[PDB]
Amino acid sequence: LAHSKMVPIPAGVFTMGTDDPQIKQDGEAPARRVTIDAFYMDAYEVSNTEFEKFVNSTGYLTEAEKFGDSFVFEGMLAAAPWWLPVKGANWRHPEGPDSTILHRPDHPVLHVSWNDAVAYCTWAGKRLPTEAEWEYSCRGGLHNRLFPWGNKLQPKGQHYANIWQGEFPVTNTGEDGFQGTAPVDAFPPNGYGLYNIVGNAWEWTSDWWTVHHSVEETLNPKGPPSGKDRVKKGGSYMSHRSYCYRYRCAARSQNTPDSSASNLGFRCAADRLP
Ligand SMILES: *[C@@H]1O[C@H](CO)[C@@H](O[C@@H]2O[C@H](CO)[C@@H](O)[C@H](O)[C@H]2NC(C)=O)[C@H](O)[C@H]1NC(C)=O
Ligand SMILES: [Ca+2]
Ligand SMILES: [Ca+2]
C-alpha cells in the first residue's frame, strides 16, 4: 500500500462548471475558463489507516468526538429523514458505538469535519485543494464531460465509481460491489491517476460556498472571501440519478465546517511534494 501517494496534476486551462447545469440551485453554471498552476493531488481519499497515523502522532480529537454525535445514514444502522444524529458515531465507529473500522482499514475515513481535514492535511505537509483544483483534477484531462472518464455512467458495461444502485433510500443492490464505502484504491483511476474522485466519500475543499459565479477568466481562484458553509465535491456511495445526481465533476454541495457525516471524507493537495 502507498495510500498517501500524490500525483502531479499538470498546469492547464479548463472549463469549470457547465452551461448545461443539472442542479441549477447549486450554481453549476455558468461555465467559466480557469487557469490552474501545476500542483500535486493525493491519488486516494485519506484512509482510516492514514488518519490513524495522524491521530497516533498528534492525539487529535475530531469534532464529532467532542460533540458526541455525527450523522449516520438510516440504511446502515438532519438534512433528510434518512440522516440521523447518532450518539457515539465518529471516524472509529462509523455507524455508532457498536461499529468498528477494524475490518475496513483501507476505506476512506469518515465523520471528519472541514477543520479535521485541514488539521490532517497540514500535519501531512499538505493542504485541502480549492474547488477549482479539485474539479480540474476530477475532470482528468477531458473537456466538458459529465464524469472523470466521459459521459457514459458504465462505459463498456463496467462500473467506474462507487455510488448507489437500486431504489434510494430503501434498497441498495450493491451491484457495483459495495453497499457502503469501498477501499480507497478501488475502481479505475481517471486520466490523472486519481481514484474515487467521484463517488465513495464526498470530499471537502478549501472554498467558502457561493452559488454566484462570474464568467470572467481566473487564475488559481480560491472562492469567495467569506461564507458560512465550505464546498464539498464528488458525491458518495449514496448518490443516485434519482435524487442526488452529484457524482459529476461539475456538481457541488456544502456544509458548515464543523459538520460531519457517514459519507463525507477528503483528500489533500500540495504545491510541491512534501
Ligand atoms: C496507532 O498506534 C497503535 C497503538 O500503538 C498501533 O497499534 C499497536 O502497534 C504496535 C506496534 O507495532 C503493535 O505491536 C501492537 O499490537 C498495537 N497495539 C494495539 C493495541 O493495537 C497502531 O498500529 C497505530 N496505527 C497506525 C496506522 O500506525
Ligand atoms: Ca455502491
Ligand atoms: Ca470520493
Q: Give domain limits for the chain.
A: 1-274
Q: Which residues does a gap of C–N over 2.5 Å follow in the chain? A: 77
Provide the CATH topology of domain 1-274. paralog of FGE (formylglycine-generating enzyme) (3.90.1580)
Instruction: Label residue 235 exposed, middle or buried (CB < 10 Å: 0-12, 13-18, 19+).
Output: buried
Q: What's the half-sphere exposure (Cβ side, CA atoms, 13 Å) at 178?
A: 22
Query: What does residue 24 show for φ and ψ, rounded to 5 degrees?
Result: -60, -35
| Partner residues linked to 233 by β-bridges | 203
For ligand 1, whether the C-beta of 56 sits within 6 Å is yes
CA 240 / ligand 2 centre spacing (Å):
10
**In contact, 23 and 7? CB cutoff 8 Å:** no
Residue 49 CA: nearest ligand 1 atom is 27
The span from the CA of 100 to the CA of 95, in Å, is 8
The span from the CA of 186 to the CA of 177, in Å, is 10
The span from the CA of 185 to the CA of 33, in Å, is 31
CB atoms within 10 A of CB 104: 18
**Which ligand neighbours the alpha carbon of 263 most closely?**
3
Q: What's the half-sphere exposure (Cβ side, CA atoms, 13 Å) at 240?
A: 17
Q: Give the torsion sign (CA, 148, 151, 152, 156).
A: negative
Vertex 216 angle, CA 213 and 218, to 5°: 95
For ligand 1, whether the C-beta of 59 sits within 6 Å is no
Q: How far is the CA of 3 from the CAs of 42, 49, 115, in angstroms?
A: 8, 9, 21
- Strand pairing report for 39-42 and 6-9: antiparallel
Instruction: Label residue 22 exposed, middle or buried (CB < 10 Å: 0-12, 13-18, 19+).
Output: middle
**Which ligand neighbours the alpha carbon of 44 most closely?**
3
**In contact, 200 and 161? CB cutoff 8 Å:** yes
Vertex 80 angle, CA 242 and 111, to 5°: 100
* DSSP three-state, residue 85: strand
**Which ligand neighbours the alpha carbon of 160 most closely?**
2
The span from the CA of 67 to the CA of 50, in Å, is 23
CA 56 / ligand 1 centre spacing (Å):
9
Among 56, 91, 100, 107, name the best residue to mutate to test ligand 1's pocket (greatest count of ligand atoms within 8 A of Cβ): 56
**In contact, 183 and 214? CB cutoff 8 Å:** no
Instruction: Label residue 138 exposed, middle or buried (CB < 10 Å: 0-12, 13-18, 19+).
Output: buried
Residue 50 CA: nearest ligand 1 atom is 27
Q: Could you tell me the three cell numbers for 87?
A: 450518539
